[PDB]
Design an enzyme around this catalytic site. Structure first.
Site, mmCIF file in Angstrom:
data_model
loop_
_atom_site.group_PDB
_atom_site.id
_atom_site.type_symbol
_atom_site.label_atom_id
_atom_site.label_comp_id
_atom_site.label_asym_id
_atom_site.label_seq_id
_atom_site.Cartn_x
_atom_site.Cartn_y
_atom_site.Cartn_z
ATOM 1 N N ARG A 40 2.540 -3.385 9.872
ATOM 2 C CA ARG A 40 3.352 -3.067 8.991
ATOM 3 C C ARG A 40 4.937 -3.470 8.990
ATOM 4 N NH1 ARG A 40 0.640 3.100 8.830
ATOM 5 N NH2 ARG A 40 -1.342 2.242 8.999
ATOM 6 N N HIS B 19 -11.787 0.717 0.380
ATOM 7 C CA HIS B 19 -10.574 -0.442 0.077
ATOM 8 C C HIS B 19 -11.035 -1.289 -0.824
ATOM 9 C CE1 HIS B 19 -6.640 -1.989 0.725
ATOM 10 N NE2 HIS B 19 -7.443 -3.287 0.747
ATOM 11 N N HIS C 262 3.061 -5.384 4.191
ATOM 12 C CA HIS C 262 2.159 -5.841 5.406
ATOM 13 C C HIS C 262 2.511 -7.275 5.883
ATOM 14 C CE1 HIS C 262 -0.400 -2.491 6.564
ATOM 15 N NE2 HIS C 262 -0.228 -2.157 5.274
ATOM 16 N N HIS D 69 0.735 4.701 1.740
ATOM 17 C CA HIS D 69 -0.248 5.231 2.946
ATOM 18 C C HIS D 69 -0.095 6.939 2.724
ATOM 19 C CE1 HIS D 69 -1.093 1.965 5.754
ATOM 20 N NE2 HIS D 69 -0.601 1.138 4.899
ATOM 21 N N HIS E 230 -4.409 4.442 4.510
ATOM 22 C CA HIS E 230 -4.057 4.297 2.857
ATOM 23 C C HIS E 230 -4.220 5.749 2.350
ATOM 24 C CE1 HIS E 230 -5.305 -0.321 2.947
ATOM 25 N NE2 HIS E 230 -4.442 0.078 3.954
ATOM 26 N N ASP F 13 -4.204 1.752 -3.197
ATOM 27 C CA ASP F 13 -4.300 0.239 -3.201
ATOM 28 C C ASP F 13 -3.600 -0.562 -4.197
ATOM 29 O OD1 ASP F 13 -5.769 0.397 -0.639
ATOM 30 O OD2 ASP F 13 -7.735 0.337 -1.649
ATOM 31 N N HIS G 100 0.747 -1.296 -0.045
ATOM 32 C CA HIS G 100 0.048 -0.148 -0.003
ATOM 33 C C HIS G 100 0.589 1.221 0.009
ATOM 34 C CE1 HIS G 100 -2.623 -2.528 2.710
ATOM 35 N NE2 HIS G 100 -3.094 -2.912 1.461
ATOM 36 N N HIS H 79 -8.717 2.588 -2.967
ATOM 37 C CA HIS H 79 -8.138 3.854 -2.524
ATOM 38 C C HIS H 79 -6.716 4.094 -3.603
ATOM 39 C CE1 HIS H 79 -9.101 2.459 1.570
ATOM 40 N NE2 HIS H 79 -10.037 3.467 0.987
HETATM 41 ZN ZN ZN Z 1 -6.739 0.640 0.750
HETATM 42 ZN ZN ZN Z 2 -1.346 -0.550 4.749
#
Ligand code: ZN
Ligand code: ZN
Ligand code: Q8H
Ligand code: Q8H
Ligand code: SE
Ligand code: ZN
Ligand code: ZN
Lengths: 153, 153
Positions: A143, A71, A120, A48, A63, A83, A46, A80
């Protein structure tokens, strides 16, 4: 042509290098590189919102979601901007990353320069997990490693 | 307002957090925070062109110089955009950073987001060193710590 780069580091053994290249501001972004130290399987991947690593990967915030969507996976309309789905590690603990994405950008608008890339602990369920958290984070867990996306030569 | 942040990391540990705040795109940028693990005295303090820390601080390239000028001090008309002069460490090995600068920005083509902040081994001579290197790097020696400048909340 615009290029960006991100060094992924965290508290544990997960580390990586991710490159971004975009031929034109209205064009897709190629994402490529390698991440080591991952458990075999899918790992949420992702952008962020904040390029803030002051207290580690937690300071990166939620995100990157400038369009206030739910999401999803990178191939969904409902996603997002940040994503990018999952990277896949084999038994060798290495993910070879090769992504093309049309929603992230390195110029114009929706730009990810100065934001944080995070890998992640668990699979991002791409909003198909069957609970509320699925539509927010994708249930990808802790994370493991992150870095600020910087301008490259 | 627009805010940015940078975590400086290098061997020592030389470790710092630097905050940037700009009230308006036509206004000055306030730069503040703290750096620990420095030798007592002046340390060159620069924005470098690339937010690329893939090989540590060396991958950051030269001073951020979008206007193709020579190296100077932050008070000089003739300076690189990235020329933020020196930070000062006391006997406690801590530099308390407090800068206001009108040339760096968090918007437009002087924007420093996605570039690298570097703290150096030695003093930046602010281009007044009288050898050639003074007009290019300011002779501030090795890169002790760096980080990519990210978007903050
Ligand atoms: Zn997301
Ligand atoms: Zn994330
Ligand atoms: Se990439 C981006 C997205 C939204 C707003 C601004 C930017 C941007 O690139 N800003 C820096 C800039 C702007 C114009 C020319 N050169 C750099
Ligand atoms: Se200022 C800049 C430099 C390089 C790349 C992108 C930008 C930019 O302006 N991005 C948009 C943005 C949004 C919120 C806060 N700061 C920047
Ligand atoms: Se950008
Ligand atoms: Zn320098
Ligand atoms: Zn300079």
């Amino acid at each position: 042509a615009t290029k960006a780069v991100c060094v992924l580091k965290g508290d544990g053994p997960v580390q990586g290098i991710i490159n971004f290249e975009q031929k034109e501001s209205n064009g897709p972004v190629k994402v490529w590189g390698s991440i080591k130290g991952l458990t075999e399987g899918l790992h949420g991947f992702h952008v962020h919102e904040f390029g803030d690593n002051t207290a580690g990967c937690t300071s990166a915030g939620p995100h990157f979601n400038p369009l206030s969507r739910k999401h999803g996976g990178p191939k969904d309309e409902e996603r997002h901007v940040g994503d990018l789905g999952n990277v896949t590690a084999d038994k060798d603990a290495v993910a070879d990353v090769s992504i093309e994405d049309s929603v992230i950008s390195l110029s114009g608008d929706h730009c990810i320069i100065g934001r944080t890339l995070v890998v992640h602990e668990k699979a991002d369920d791409l909003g198909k997990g069957g609970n509320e958290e699925s539509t927010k984070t994708g249930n990808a867990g802790s994370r493991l490693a992150c870095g600020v996306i910087g301008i490259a030569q």
